[PDB]
Ligand binder design. Structure first.
Ligand SMILES: [Cl-]
Ligand SMILES: [Cl-]
Ligand SMILES: [Cl-]
Ligand SMILES: [Cl-]
Ligand SMILES: [Cl-]
Ligand SMILES: [Cl-]
Ligand SMILES: [Cl-]
Ligand SMILES: [Cl-]
Ligand SMILES: [Mg+2]
Ligand SMILES: [Mg+2]
Ligand SMILES: [Mg+2]
Ligand SMILES: [Mg+2]
Ligand SMILES: [Mg+2]
Ligand SMILES: [Mg+2]
Ligand SMILES: [Mg+2]
Ligand SMILES: [Mg+2]
Ligand SMILES: [Mg+2]
Ligand SMILES: [Mg+2]
Ligand SMILES: [Mg+2]
Ligand SMILES: [Mg+2]
Ligand SMILES: [Mg+2]
Ligand SMILES: [Mg+2]
Ligand SMILES: [Mg+2]
Ligand SMILES: [Mg+2]
Ligand SMILES: [Mg+2]
Ligand SMILES: [Mg+2]
Ligand SMILES: [Mg+2]
Ligand SMILES: [Mg+2]
Ligand SMILES: [Mg+2]
Ligand SMILES: [Mg+2]
Ligand SMILES: [Mg+2]
Ligand SMILES: [Mg+2]
Ligand SMILES: [Mg+2]
Ligand SMILES: [Mg+2]
Ligand SMILES: [Mg+2]
Ligand SMILES: [Mg+2]
Ligand SMILES: [Mg+2]
Ligand SMILES: [Mg+2]
Ligand SMILES: [Mg+2]
Ligand SMILES: [Mg+2]
Ligand SMILES: [Mg+2]
Ligand SMILES: [Mg+2]
Ligand SMILES: [Mg+2]
Ligand SMILES: [Mg+2]
Ligand SMILES: [Mg+2]
Ligand SMILES: [Mg+2]
Ligand SMILES: [Mg+2]
Ligand SMILES: [Mg+2]
Ligand SMILES: [Mg+2]
Ligand SMILES: [Mg+2]
Ligand SMILES: [Mg+2]
Ligand SMILES: [Mg+2]
Ligand SMILES: [Mg+2]
Ligand SMILES: [Mg+2]
Ligand SMILES: [Mg+2]
Ligand SMILES: [Mg+2]
Ligand SMILES: [Mg+2]
Ligand SMILES: [Mg+2]
Ligand SMILES: [Mg+2]
Ligand SMILES: [Mg+2]
Ligand SMILES: [Mg+2]
Lengths: 136, 103, 189, 124
RNA sequence: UUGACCUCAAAUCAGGUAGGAGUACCCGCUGAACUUAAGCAUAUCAAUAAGCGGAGGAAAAGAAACCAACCGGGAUUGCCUUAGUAACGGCGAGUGAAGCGGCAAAAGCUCAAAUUUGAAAUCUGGUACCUUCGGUGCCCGAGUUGUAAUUUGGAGAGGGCAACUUUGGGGCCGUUCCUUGUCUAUGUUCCUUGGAACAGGACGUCAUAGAGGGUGAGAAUCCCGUGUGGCGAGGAGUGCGGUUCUUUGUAAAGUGCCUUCGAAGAGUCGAGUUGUUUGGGAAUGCAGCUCUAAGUGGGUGGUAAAUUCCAUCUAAAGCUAAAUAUUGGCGAGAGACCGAUAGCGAACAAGUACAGUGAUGGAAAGAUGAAAAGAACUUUGAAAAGAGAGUGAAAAAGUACGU
RNA sequence: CACGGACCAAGGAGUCUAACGUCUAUGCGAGUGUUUGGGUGUAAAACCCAUACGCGUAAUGAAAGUGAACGUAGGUUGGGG
RNA sequence: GUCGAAUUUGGGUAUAGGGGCGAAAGACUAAUCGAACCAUCUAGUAGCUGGUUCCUGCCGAAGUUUCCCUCAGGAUAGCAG
RNA sequence: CGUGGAGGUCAGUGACGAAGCCUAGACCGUAAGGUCGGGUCGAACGGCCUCUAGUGCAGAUCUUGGUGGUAGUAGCAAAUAUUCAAAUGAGAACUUUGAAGACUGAAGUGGGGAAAGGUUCCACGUCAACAGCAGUUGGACGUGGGUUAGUCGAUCCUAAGA
RNA sequence: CUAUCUAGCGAAACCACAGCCAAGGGAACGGGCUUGGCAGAAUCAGCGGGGAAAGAAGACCCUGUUGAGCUUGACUCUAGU
RNA sequence: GUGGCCUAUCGAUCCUUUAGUCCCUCGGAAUUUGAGGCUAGAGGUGCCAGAAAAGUUACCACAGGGAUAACUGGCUUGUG
């Protein structure tokens, strides 16, 4: 379902353009929410990927793939010891998984001008006044 | 901080000023008016031997300038050392002196 | 706030622009660090020229298609025509691009000539380890410059067949405009 | 003029490093030149001052007086000479602080460590 | 009865791991209003502040389901430009990118999908020993509901024929880089003033050293340093310059020709609808619900649709230095900056004294003299002190102290 | 019989920036702009430089588009020298 | 006024800001209540009130026109340098 | 015209006294201001040609700090009340002792505790500040001493609730 | 019991400069200006005529394209159902 | 003779719609629908140079105004 705005009794205290309560949508997918809660449950592991398995009217079901960065079978494996690097801690929290990059709009082409290399970094670049020593 | 600090000057007009400055160095009236002690120097501009470029020691370099007539200008710099007259003394600008010859 | 005869202005300063002002005070500092980086890299890397060999390609778009410039890398066919493999070329100082294709013979021949000239002006030291001492040249692009191909001679003979150049352009423009309708008219009969 | 990027010409930094210098660093700052007789004999210009050294005063109102160094008061950037004191009105006598740069060492108190220092400086 | 398998438990079982802090810069979520429109609701402020989750020395992005329409370009990031432009907008106020071009830096790549099948060839742990960021032997366990080798689209693979070419891993000694120590010039020579010469005058010396500071007043030559070089000590990383011990191997890799093949990711793409967002306008991206594919297929080609072509890439799986950012931390160098009501709130026992139940709020306050030489002693007074005397260049400097 | 001012010292208010109009000074001139960057250096200075890009040298149409000499670059009237 | 009860009161405990609590006065919620206190957004906006720092010299106004949710304000023409 | 800072110059002034400050003393300029003498003082500062700005105050119920007139003025009048002598001391309406006169009148101005305060408790020494007069006294100032549990509480139990 | 006088102790409000009137004119009710009346140090206790006395940037009224509390088939929305 | 004998009898941008030209564009190349432009009208703003808009405050707030009302005083004297 949708994400109801958590305001008391529906009052928003603002302009009518922001008075919506019921028809609002969460910007991350339910698949992303599944990975986050599994990630907190097993904080000694690293989230690799996840996939859809089932659904009903109330719930969607997913299975999350996890890799142990402390196990010697992983640290000695050349194809998977990249995950042991500290830069890959909590990938699902920062949206670095496959579902995370989809919701961030990390793709190529004219359709993704706003989010090619990070939406907020692009906004900073386009809203920055650049001055040189010899003014242009 | 985004106050303008550097000033852009046209390249050709910049060279115009440099050429005018070079020509003024050959006029004895202007050199004397700028405070240099060239009263007893016969010919302006002053050209010396190319052997000056190969001098290694300061003692002989001063002697070479001494023998060509720049002694009075060198002495003027030494006797003009003074303490600055304001708050610039404790901003790494403590002593002021004159300008000597340019080689 | 409108008065007198003045041009309409469009200054975009209605946000918190003062929080994102970037003054390049370190322009001189960055130039020194870039020169230090290039000096340290050259002394460390090898007596090799510090940059890879690049091909010559035609610039796209009708505005710039009259000039040639340096491209990404030599194609697989261009590398093969020079007499070496792509894997070996990358380790010898030649940039290789696998997604560029060859459609023009003049560009293909020029790039093959560059690879042949490059192989004749380098010394590949053996893996044995002797490595006879050689001077380091800091640039491979300056050694092999890119030149604009010649188009026509300085002077020729006037050859007029009587047809108007203006008329030719008008007919070509008109014939393209009515190609679809004329095909439809002929198709219905 | 300064030619190195590691040395600073800032007046503020130079004065802070002097007043906040540790005890070991103040020993070098409290150096005195040797006499004419000692410089010829030893071949060196100046040495850090030490207790039990014989000195001569060459500047100030106490010029010409000699004595042994009784205390090197590093905390005050000064040294005290046994025979150079001042008599208070009540009769008590207090030492007079003197800077080692205004003194001349006439006799050196020697030991194993100072012999090595003289030789490490090229002296004999 | 007994022995397995599957699933699910327990133990202060053997060995590990997560939390909190910091948060300037970085990756996400969530999310205003003041304000502007001379009112005001869309819009604007702003995809901002506040709130929440998560990293590093950078992060993120990244080797095209790209840009293009050209004689085509060819991962990503940043700078100059495109451009206040195309476009959006009570088409009002306002808002607003991208391709090309020049430059900085440059680097490429690997899994899934194939029978090793004449031999699971793979791996954690335990234990003994050794040349100990590991190695060998042995023994349990994991794993066939798939662990190695081989192949990732640029290809490539199974057979056939024919040719030559090319090596692997450490020790030791230098070099490079970092943290440190030590050594390496020249007056205190005369006269005057002064409490003090570091001042003035005279006569010199050194200088690849006349930066800076100290010393009883403006000191290149009194002291520390400064300039130029020499000689050491302790580490890091194999970046590479020479030597030295092993032959890795009926091993591995590259290249020609012929033939047969060529596996490429699903509640995903795509579509409808709702909300949000964008310059994106019959709908730019994202998300919820509903529907739900194909394999000469699929996406894209900035105006919705039917029909016929063309161009260009290969999504729904993954890794990766440099050019870039940095009001935090650590170590340095600087200023046409401020000079104690200034400059940080704080030059001082300053986030201190103090106020508030609490969240929080938050000061004032630098200068005796070169040196205490901080006033012995006499006298009047209960005493504080006064008057003499004394110290000092000066008490018109007396710890209520420069002026 | 309107408002602030009991007194004194120190502090105390048209600034900077982006984009522009008129005028003026300067350089070059159908061209002009070295300083994004590179070279170099006595090192944030000074000095040197390639390719681009901006503006100007053509306008006019919503657009597809087209695109400035009949002539001593015209005639008449007034014009300093 | 009331004084054996709908009495008075200590301690413990519960209810927190568009919320609480109210035998109901818009009363009370730490001297603050017809919406508490604290920090930040925030130097919020103001066609409105106040102030706006040296000398001399020369020139020297306007309260009128048209339009405006315009009437304590602007644009525009005029007057001035 | 004047102020803070910057490039150049006058080989400018200065411990034989720079800057600042005081001065019904002198001189120049229409003026903004400039110059000199005297006193005080103790370490730096100025003229001219140019550069630069956080550059000139009488007011803003302006900011911070300091100081007046008012003025030795308003006032120091609730809680019935004090008096004599001696001792101590430089000093006694107020300290100590004795004597006398009074009050709280057991729902107290008596004797203990809870909350709260934190050494105010006690002794010795001592009076600059504090006790809106005074002070030899003090809950003040300086230096020390003092709180002893198997049975008194906490600790244990549960209440509304957390 | 104060006030009052003495010893000790010792504030505040307020303050452009100040403090004798009549008429006149004047911002249409002067301590100052004009014309007259007049006018002699320094002061103590009282007193409430005046100082349009002091205490607060009028709460009344109007203006502003400034708010807030409350109400209603005002305009536009919304939790819930 | 280019409406009413003359002097009044009326309406921008955006949007919608009609008429005309059957012309221009949909930017990889075409045909047909659809959409967007060009020229001339209509749908209306009467606060008529053209915001889309109900009350109450005796619980009240702020910036101001003697440019402006509720006392004196002044001018005037209809009225008394
Ligand atoms: Cl001096
Ligand atoms: Cl739409
Ligand atoms: Cl600090
Ligand atoms: Cl508080
Ligand atoms: Cl046209
Ligand atoms: Cl609360
Ligand atoms: Cl004057
Ligand atoms: Cl009387
Ligand atoms: Mg255990
Ligand atoms: Mg508004
Ligand atoms: Mg307004
Ligand atoms: Mg409003
Ligand atoms: Mg934030
Ligand atoms: Mg870290
Ligand atoms: Mg980096
Ligand atoms: Mg990364
Ligand atoms: Mg690929
Ligand atoms: Mg690219
Ligand atoms: Mg925006
Ligand atoms: Mg949102
Ligand atoms: Mg990545
Ligand atoms: Mg301060
Ligand atoms: Mg003196
Ligand atoms: Mg007023
Ligand atoms: Mg007043
Ligand atoms: Mg002032
Ligand atoms: Mg009760
Ligand atoms: Mg009521
Ligand atoms: Mg302001
Ligand atoms: Mg006149
Ligand atoms: Mg209107
Ligand atoms: Mg007014
Ligand atoms: Mg003086
Ligand atoms: Mg005077
Ligand atoms: Mg001094
Ligand atoms: Mg100012
Ligand atoms: Mg003042
Ligand atoms: Mg004024
Ligand atoms: Mg005041
Ligand atoms: Mg009295
Ligand atoms: Mg009283
Ligand atoms: Mg009484
Ligand atoms: Mg009684
Ligand atoms: Mg009684
Ligand atoms: Mg007691
Ligand atoms: Mg008293
Ligand atoms: Mg007393
Ligand atoms: Mg005490
Ligand atoms: Mg009168
Ligand atoms: Mg009066
Ligand atoms: Mg009179
Ligand atoms: Mg008012
Ligand atoms: Mg008011
Ligand atoms: Mg109005
Ligand atoms: Mg309102
Ligand atoms: Mg008729
Ligand atoms: Mg008619
Ligand atoms: Mg198209
Ligand atoms: Mg109108
Ligand atoms: Mg009036
Ligand atoms: Mg009558």
């Amino acid at each position: 379902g949708n994400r109801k705005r958590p305001v008391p009794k529906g009052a928003t205290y603002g302009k009518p353009t922001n008075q919506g309560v019921n028809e609002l949508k969460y910007q991350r997918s339910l698949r992303a929410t599944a990975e986050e809660r599994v990630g907190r449950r097993a904080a000694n592991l690293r989230v690799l990927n996840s996939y859809w398995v089932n659904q009903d009217s109330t719930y969607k079901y997913f299975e999350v793939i996890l890799v142990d960065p402390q196990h010697k079978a992983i640290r000695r494996d050349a194809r998977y010891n990249w995950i042991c690097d500290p830069v890959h801690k909590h990938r699902e929290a920062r949206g670095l998984t496959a579902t995370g990059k989809k919701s961030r709009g990390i793709n190529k082409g004219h359709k993704f001008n706003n989010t090619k290399a990070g939406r907020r970094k692009t906004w900073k670049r386009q809203n920055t006044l650049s001055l040189w020593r010899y003014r242009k | 901080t985004w106050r303008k600090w550097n000033v852009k000057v046209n390249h050709n007009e910049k060279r115009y000023a440099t050429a005018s400055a070079i020509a003024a160095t050959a006029v004895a009236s202007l050199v004397l008016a700028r405070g240099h002690r060239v009263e007893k120097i016969p010919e302006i501009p002053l050209v010396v031997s190319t052997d000056l470029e190969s001098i290694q020691k300061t003692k002989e370099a001063v002697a070479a300038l001494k023998a060509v007539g720049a002694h009075s200008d060198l002495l003027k710099v030494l006797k003009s050392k003074k303490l600055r007259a304001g708050k610039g003394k404790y901003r790494n600008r403590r002593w002021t002196q004159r300008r000597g010859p340019l080689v | 706030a409108i008065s007198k005869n003045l041009p309409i202005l469009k200054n975009h300063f209605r946000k918190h622009w003062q929080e994102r002002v970037k003054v390049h005070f370190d322009q001189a500092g960055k130039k020194v660090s870039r020169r230090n980086a290039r000096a340290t890299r050259a002394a460390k890397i090898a007596p090799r020229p510090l940059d890879l060999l690049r091909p010559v390609v035609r610039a796209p778009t009708v505005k710039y298609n009259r000039k040639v410039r340096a491209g990404r890398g030599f194609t697989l066919a261009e590398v093969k025509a020079a007499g070496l493999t792509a894997a070996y070329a990358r380790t010898i100082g030649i940039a290789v691009d696998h997604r560029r294709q060859n459609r023009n013979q003049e560009i293909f021949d020029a790039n093959v000539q560059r690879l042949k000239e490059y192989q004749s002006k380098i010394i590949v030291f053996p893996r044995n380890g002797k490595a006879p001492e050689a001077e380091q040249v800091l640039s491979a692009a300056a050694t092999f410059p890119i030149a604009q191909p010649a188009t026509d001679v300085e002077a020729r003979a006037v050859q007029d067949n009587g047809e108007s150049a203006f008329r030719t352009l008008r007919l070509a423009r008109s014939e393209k405009k009515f190609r679809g309708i004329r095909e439809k008219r002929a198709r219905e009969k | 003029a300064k030619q190195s990027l590691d040395v600073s010409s800032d007046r503020r930094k130079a004065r802070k490093a002097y007043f906040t210098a540790p005890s070991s660093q103040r020993r070098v700052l409290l150096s005195a030149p040797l006499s004419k007789e000692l410089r010829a004999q030893y071949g060196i210009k100046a040495l850090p001052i030490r207790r039990d050294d014989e000195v001569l005063v060459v500047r100030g109102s106490k010029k010409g007086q000699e004595g042994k160094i009784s205390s090197v008061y590093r905390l005050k950037f000064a040294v005290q000479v046994d025979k150079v004191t001042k008599e208070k009105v009540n009769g008590a006598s207090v030492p007079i602080n003197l800077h080692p740069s205004k003194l001349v060492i006439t006799k050196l108190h020697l030991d194993k460590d100072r012999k090595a220092l003289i030789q490490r400086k090229g002296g004999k």
